[PDB]
Ligand binder design. Structure first.
Ligand SMILES: Nc1ncnc2c1ncn2[C@@H]1O[C@H](COP(=O)(O)OP(=O)(O)O)[C@@H](O)[C@H]1O
Ligand SMILES: Nc1ncnc2c1ncn2[C@@H]1O[C@H](COP(=O)(O)OP(=O)(O)O)[C@@H](O)[C@H]1O
Ligand SMILES: [Ca+2]
Ligand SMILES: [Ca+2]
Ligand SMILES: [Ca+2]
Ligand SMILES: [Mg+2]
Ligand SMILES: [Mg+2]
Lengths: 126, 375, 160, 74, 375
């Protein structure tokens, strides 16, 4: 085999990877929509009286506070998780550093200028 | 990692934290009680932004991090270090959350109420724990010893507790704590080594000489006679090789370092030596059980790992007490972990599973009421 | 070598003829029939820039596929096409984590050979067993049967 | 003592978002539309929560992944 | 010529200016730090009226132009030469204006405040630069080395800096600069060659003998023994061919020229040799990290291109320090450009793109406040 075939396989991997990510994003959007429809159901204001609307609004405010409490707990969890992820990632960076600093070679002179200087008028396709 | 819903035994002893699951015979996560804080401010880019090291991560780097002791004499100085060491033990070694199993912690005898209320509040409000329990170390050590009678001498790092228990019975009135332990011995060795000629004034060297003491320092069988025979030293003085390579030569100082325990006058305190304080405690007990306390005395604490403590105790007590009865001193092997071991065997009983304190009753009652319920 | 050989095969026939002519020009009068450190430095002087000897060694080591310490035609194409940096512009860390996750579909922390093979099967291109083995080796360093995240990161050099 | 205040601030954070509501100056019809805006707030809230949840899941995988790295380069 | 908006890395090291774009592995524009000024006044018509030569244009003509060093020991003597060398590098080699990309300059450790404020003012007021940044050379050299621990020894042309960095932590208190380097070695070789018989007293010859030293002069593995065996020379003395053609014969002087670094008494200064000063610096550090500093010592500077420095350092440190531990000295290939290389890899990070200093904040704050912000 050759190396060009491996590069072609890798780039095909990348595009099929991106399409998969888009599909997963669409599935997550659909799951979010369905979960929203299940949890937060519409209201039924038809037939409610003056005091009944007041009681409904008070109940909605209580539900508002309950959901914010849940969200705040989940957000505290997410912040702890962010902190832990940062710590672990930096520890892994310190571990894996050692001798793996790379660079692209600079004596690799640009072909366009090199092609002009070597050929003159013969260089047309390159 | 754990398939049994059992309490995590975390002995937060002064100087060494020993954490492990219940049922085990030894703590898996053993690390010193120290907190390393970045001293300077670096312009470097890429290193961990973590602003608070702990445990082995701090032990590995003691030249850059200023070292602070999270516990002093027994009273908790800084609570941030407390939250750091528990959060670390939970989410870096054990790899388990406290929201799935209980936690049997061990605290020292005669501690402040602020300490207890603070740790309980951090373990209930902040962390979601189904149930907590505070336990005295002496009872668990006597459990691990496999007896019900004797006086437990627990010598930690900054405090020393003498606790008499006869017929499995506690005596809260006789428990007397004295802040003489490994730190004051490290300070005495440091000042006498400064008098020898090698002067240092930083904490990293203090921990190094503490380790040197743990490895080499022993107790003398006859102080003055060893002084006389060491005046002309030959095999009495030893040449230790520092982990860095500097050749240190230490002679008599070794067996004169723990001697400060027997002669607190060296540190200019009117307090009596550990042996004399224990003897006075025995007089404070009743005469009927005094012989049993003589025959069942038990020891605990890492400081007891020095060779020659049992014989010194026997000669001193024989010189103080009559020499007509029998005064046998028993020291169980691996006594230091024995306390923790007790915790393990204490967390497997179903009755103990019925003596835990759940969140809801604590929340309504409040921390102070919880203090009344325990004792 | 991967991006290099890809660019080489992407060359046209007329370009490769000019490359062969330039090779004959560089080895004009040589004694090994190839471009060694001596001949490469001679060409660099003929151009203008001066190359470090250790740099000449490291460059010849980055273009050879045989092991001669000299640059032949098959390596002349690589040495004359390496100018464009194809493996640059590394994907964001979040994108790399996404790549590892979707390659680790069963949620385990390791890209077993089964996942790599089904991925190659899904891509649609005719996957050769040699390609599978070479990619498996390129990823799985310790050769334990799976590509962890560090080995996967190693799999991103020469890839874009 | 600042940690106790930290827990108090946690409860105080929740207290800050809630504000007194007035149902006396509103009529029958307006209250209905106002109820709807309260409802949308609910909706909004859960959405962010959901997001967090999904991120949490993702983040957990990250953790797992990270752990493996320290178990492969030690 | 450049299609990426990235900072221009211009290392203005004493003796050699190395300028190039970020991302490259070596500086493209490398020229000595010298300024040639027309000595006489010519009645000729047609020649360039340019009153200030620089770089290769001055190197090509050293007989007509009186040579002045734009940097001495570290302190900037003349600022006109500074403006000349930057304006030249900008509008004669790189062919790019500073109004389109940043500029990451590298300055020596422990430099005057006047130097920093002056260069920053010339880079902000006169030239329109979107952002500037001053960086110490030792950190970038340690970056290029690919480590975070060790003591960097940077020996430029007129100054030598010893900078210890352990675990990435800079130590601004231990950095000690000493003005012993290539110029004092050139002066020593010149006076000893005048002692040999070939006497010169002009700067062009001084630069020529400097080049001769760079090409031939090496460090001795045993000074006195080489002196004894060179007393009766055969292969120890070499005959060099001057670029002009005069046949010079140089024997032992070679490996006695850099020896002045190890024995500053030759130049009548109480300062200690580079090795002894580094050793004293190691004692000034803490003991815990001293072994790591022994195992990770790094070198930088063009003066380190001589053959035989690593072995001499190893024998001298082994003779000074104990011979029980392991003291490996590591010298990365092409160390001289490594510093510049670091600059390149430091200018590609997005975070570093966030740590630049824009014009407006500097203008309101003023230069002194900018000094506080950096450190
Ligand atoms: N292996 C050992 N050898 C000698 N001394 C020790 C050892 N381990 C701990 N110590 C000493 O014990 C003290 C800490 O004891 P601690 O861990 O609190 O005991 P416990 O956990 O039984 O309460 C320190 O001062 C330390 O010097
Ligand atoms: N190729 C070389 N061989 C020997 N010595 C050199 C060489 N290049 C430079 N030097 C010496 O180094 C000094 C200049 O070093 P410098 O360019 O400041 O190093 P850096 O750029 O790493 O700070 C001069 O005294 C010069 O004699
Ligand atoms: Ca070849
Ligand atoms: Ca998998
Ligand atoms: Ca593998
Ligand atoms: Mg103890
Ligand atoms: Mg230098």
């Amino acid at each position: 085999i050759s190396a060009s075939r491996k590069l072609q396989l890798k780039t095909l991997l990348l595009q099929i990877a991106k399409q998969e990510l888009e599909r997963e994003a669409e599935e997550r959007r659909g799951e979010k929509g369905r979960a929203l429809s299940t949890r937060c159901q519409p209201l039924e204001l038809a037939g409610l009286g003056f005091a009944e609307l007041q009681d409904l609004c008070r109940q909605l405010h209580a539900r508002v506070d309950k959901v914010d409490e849940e969200r705040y707990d989940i957000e505290a969890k997410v912040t702890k998780n962010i902190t832990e992820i940062a710590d672990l990632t930096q520890k892994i960076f310190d571990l894996r550093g050692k001798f793996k600093r790379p660079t692209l070679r600079r004596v690799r002179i640009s072909a366009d200028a090199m092609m002009q200087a070597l050929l003159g008028a013969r260089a047309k396709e390159s | 990692d754990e398939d049994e819903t059992t309490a995590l035994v975390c002995d937060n002893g002064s100087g060494l934290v020993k954490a492990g699951f219940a049922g085990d015979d030894a703590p898996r996560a053993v690390f010193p009680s120290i907190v390393g804080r970045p001293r300077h401010q670096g312009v470097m880019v890429g290193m961990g932004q973590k602003d608070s090291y702990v445990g082995d991560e701090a032990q590995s780097k003691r030249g850059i991090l200023t070292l602070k002791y999270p516990i002093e004499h027994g009273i908790i100085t800084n609570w941030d270090d407390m939250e750091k060491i528990w959060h670390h033990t939970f989410y870096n070694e054990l790899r388990v959350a406290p929201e799935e199993h209980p936690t049997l912690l061990t605290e020292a005898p005669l501690n402040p109420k602020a300490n207890r209320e603070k740790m309980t509040q951090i373990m209930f409000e902040t962390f979601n724990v189904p149930a907590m329990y505070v336990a005295i170390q002496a009872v668990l050590s006597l459990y691990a010893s496999g007896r019900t009678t004797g006086i437990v001498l627990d010598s930690g790092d900054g405090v020393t507790h003498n606790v008499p228990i006869y017929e499995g019975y506690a005596l809260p009135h006789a428990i007397m704590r004295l802040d003489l332990a490994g730190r004051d011995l490290t300070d005495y060795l440091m000042k006498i080594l400064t008098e020898r000629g090698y002067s240092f004034v930083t904490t990293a060297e203090r921990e190094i000489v503490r380790d040197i003491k743990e490895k080499l320092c022993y107790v003398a069988l006859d102080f003055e006679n060893e002084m006389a025979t060491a005046a002309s030293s030959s095999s009495l003085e030893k040449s230790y090789e520092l982990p860095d390579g500097q050749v240190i030569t230490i002679g008599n100082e070794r067996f004169r370092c723990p001697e400060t325990l027997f002669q607190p006058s060296f540190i200019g305190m009117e307090s009596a030596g550990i042996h004399e304080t224990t003897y006075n405690s025995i007089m404070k007990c009743d005469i009927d059980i005094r012989k049993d306390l003589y025959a069942n005395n038990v020891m605990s604490g890492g400081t007891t790992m020095y060779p020659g403590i049992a014989d010194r105790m026997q000669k001193e007590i024989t010189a103080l007490a009559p020499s007509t009865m029998k005064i046998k001193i028993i020291a169980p092997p691996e006594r230091k972990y024995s306390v923790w071991i007790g915790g393990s065997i204490l967390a497997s009983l179903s009755t103990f599973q019925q003596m835990w304190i759940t969140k809801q009753e604590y929340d309504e009652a409040g921390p102070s009421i919880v203090h009344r319920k325990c004792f | 070598d991967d991006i290099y050989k890809a660019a080489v095969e992407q060359l046209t026939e007329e370009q490769k003829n000019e490359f062969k002519a330039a090779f004959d020009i560089f080895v004009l009068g040589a004694e090994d029939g190839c471009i060694s450190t001596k001949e490469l430095g001679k060409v660099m002087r003929m151009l203008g820039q001066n190359p470090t000897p250790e740099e000449l060694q490291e460059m010849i080591d980055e273009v050879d596929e045989d092991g001669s310490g000299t640059v032949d035609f098959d390596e002349f194409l690589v040495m004359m096409v390496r100018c464009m940096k194809d493996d640059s512009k590394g994907k964001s860390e979040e994108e790399l984590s996404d790549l590892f996750r979707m390659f680790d579909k069963n949620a385990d922390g390791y890209i077993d050979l089964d996942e790599l093979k089904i991925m190659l099967q899904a891509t649609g291109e005719t996957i050769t067993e040699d390609d599978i083995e070479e990619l498996m080796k390129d990823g799985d360093k310790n050769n334990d049967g799976r590509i962890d995240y560090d080995e996967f990161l190693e799999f991103m050099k020469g890839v874009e | 003592g600042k940690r106790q205040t930290e827990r108090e601030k946690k409860k105080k954070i929740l207290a800050e978002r809630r504000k007194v509501l007035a149902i006396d100056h509103l009529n029958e019809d307006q209250l209905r539309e106002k109820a709807k805006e309260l409802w949308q707030s609910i909706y909004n809230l859960e959405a962010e929560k959901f997001d967090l949840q999904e991120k949490f899941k993702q983040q957990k995988y990250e953790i797992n992944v990270l752990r493996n790295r320290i178990n492969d380069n030690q």
